[PDB]
Design a binder for these strands. Sequence first.
DNA 1: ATTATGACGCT
DNA 2: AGCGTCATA
Length: 430
Amino acid sequence: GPHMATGQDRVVALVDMDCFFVQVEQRQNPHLRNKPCAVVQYKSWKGGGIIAVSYEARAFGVTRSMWADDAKKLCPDLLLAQVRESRGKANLTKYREASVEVMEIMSRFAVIERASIDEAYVDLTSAVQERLQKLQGQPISADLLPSTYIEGLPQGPTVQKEGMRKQGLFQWLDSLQIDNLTSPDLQLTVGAVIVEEMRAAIERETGFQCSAGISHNKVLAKLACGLNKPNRQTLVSHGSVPQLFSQMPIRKIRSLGGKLGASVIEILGIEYMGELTQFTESQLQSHFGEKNGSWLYAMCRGIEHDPVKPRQLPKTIGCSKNFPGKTALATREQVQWWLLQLAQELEERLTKDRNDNDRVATQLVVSIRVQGDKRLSSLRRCCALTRYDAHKMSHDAFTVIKNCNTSGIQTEWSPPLTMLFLCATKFSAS
DNA sequence: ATTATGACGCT
DNA sequence: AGCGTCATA
Ligand SMILES: [Ca+2]
Ligand SMILES: [Mn+2]
Ligand SMILES: [Mn+2]
């Protein structure tokens, strides 16, 4: 009862850009705006691989991982933008730089955790406390929440989407106890006000639209964000969790989309997150381990303590290329030439990183895949990274992998290489 | 023949 | 350390 922790201590948001690489290309090229369009890498093989899709194109059934030739079968008027190619490979610099634009704006409001190229978590607990003091017990107007959905509302005793949104928001605001500076629901609401401001700032200063989730932890914030996309934000309260989770497939929760999630389903014979509540903590720990079990026991009740880490910059800088089917590398000079290409992009990114962010990478990680291996990586070896020089890094990379060549002939490489990967790690301040 | 990443857990 | 899992454009 009174000692039951409810995991309502924090206000956490997740902000995720809408169709991000597509918006970067649509900003650049006005002809692509408000059209079915997608972003593709490479072109020779089946028109290239789709990696981002506008909402207009999704309506035709176009998805990520689809070959553009196949996407065109669903959407004959689909417009395409190509990922840049440099040194023989896809180069994602434009999208990394656009990401920095957004992350720098978000950082003005609070400490952020960069979680991908297009999303960051925000711990708004302190910002909310500050804003609550400014508000002075004054009610929150619906006008301050013009793109916010309250999950689970409206309920109880109009037919268009925006109408429904306002109905739910009204019920929510009508219920709010604004006299209590410590009410979690009030704190979430003020959190949502700030995120409206954050999202307006991102759109004003970059042109990019985004969605967001506001809740008491990262998992719920992420889940909330996806509930009303694009260009909207969703508040998931603690109270909304039982109904929300009662029909929520387990795989939809972050970290449960893979083998662990499948094992939760199979071992326990359940389908929905809410069904987890009927197991003891020890029962869950017995099946899924101490850490996972405790996490599941709290998470199915809407509770999670994973902090928003203060980290705005990626921890590693990597360059990778696949060589599928017949393009697999079978000669030493092939292997060496491509290691050099990767190393040259890596040097360029590392040198920029050092100037921008006052740090230096100290370890070089080299990974390859061999033809036949089911695994994405076959072998991973590290060596020292002492100088930002591509010729040295590629020579060093070759040295640490050259023993994988089973071929009796030095000139030939066997089995052929279907992937190369260079990653700079272990940064130190500089 | 999705590809190019990037964080974190296990032993 | 090297490998595996899970994640996003
Ligand atoms: Ca996104
Ligand atoms: Mn994302
Ligand atoms: Mn996505």
